[PDB]
Amino acid sequence: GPNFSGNWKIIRSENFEELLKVLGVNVMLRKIAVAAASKPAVEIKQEGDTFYIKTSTTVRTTEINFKVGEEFEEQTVDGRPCKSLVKWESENKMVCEQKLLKGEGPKTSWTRELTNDGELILTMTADDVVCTRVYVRE
Ligand SMILES: *S(=O)(=O)Oc1ccc(C#Cc2ccc3c(c2)C(C)(C)CCN3C(=O)CCC(=O)O)cc1
């Protein structure tokens, strides 16, 4: 498949706030999240099926480490600890399902796809809401 490695820059975002709202994030925290996510830095180091992904804004940094096909810990988009599994849906697209570590909640998932034109699309899902974030490589 194509190499996801590099520094990625946001060019288009749909329904990030809508997604946080259906997850019950309060309006003050949603506005901070939308402002922060307006200029993120995404660093991906891909070694075959092994991924390091660092997502940084001024207010929040996540670092995840996963092998496609092995369970790992991360957080949901609204910052709840979860156990995740990634699988390849195609050469170009990984899909991830998240189970909360404690309690129940809505079913959350993400997908990351490297398009034929070099765009990285992240989709994040909860209930009927689909958030799409499109990046280009710096
Ligand atoms: S892309 O890869 O650029 O997409 C992307 C995904 C998520 C984010 C983000 C974010 C974010 C920023 C601030 C906060 C949050 C998320 C929460 C978890 C929803 C809570 C509100 N909030 C804060 O309170 C500040 C940070 C924190 O939780 O400690 C960026 C880019």
Asked if 135 and 119 touch (Cβ cutoff 8 Å), the reply is: yes
What is the Cα–Cα distance from 63 to 74, expressed in whole angstroms?
8
Resolution as reported, in Å: 2.0
Nearest CA, atom 17, ligand 1: 78
For residue 60, tell me if it sits in a domain.
Answer: yes
The CA-to-CA distance between both ends of the chain, in Å, stands at 20
For 71, phi then psi, to 5°, come to: -70, 145
From the CB of 79, is ligand 1 less than 6 Å away?
Answer: yes
User: 83-87: long-range contacts at Cβ-Cβ below 8 A with a sequence spacing of 24 or more?
Assistant: 86/51
User: Domain of 112?
Assistant: 6-137
Among 60, 120, 121, which residue has the most ligand 1 atoms within 8 Å of its CB, making it the best to mutate?
A: 60
Does 133 carry a binding-site annotation? yes
Residue 25 Cβ < 6 Å to ligand 1? yes
Domain count, the chain: 1
Q: Sign of the CA dihedral 38, 97, 73, 75?
A: positive
Q: Does residue 51 fall inside a structural domain?
A: yes
Look up the CATH number of the domain holding residue 83. 2.40.128.20
Reduced 3-state DSSP string for the chain: CCCCCEEEEEEEEECHHHHHHHCCCCHHHHHHHHHHHCCCEEEEEEECCEEEEEEECCCCEEEEEEECCCCEEEECCCCCEEEEEEEEEECCEEEEEEEECCCCCCCEEEEEEECCCCCEEEEEEECCEEEEEEEEEC
- Residues in Cβ contact with 68 at an 8 Å cutoff, skipping those fewer than 6 apart: 49, 51, 86, 87, 88, 94
**In this structure, is residue 1 part of a structural domain?**
no
Give a yes or no: residue 132 inside a domain.
yes
The reply to whether 116 falls in a domain is yes
Task: Give the span between the Cα atoms of 5 and 127, in whole angstroms.
Answer: 30
- Experimental technique: X-ray
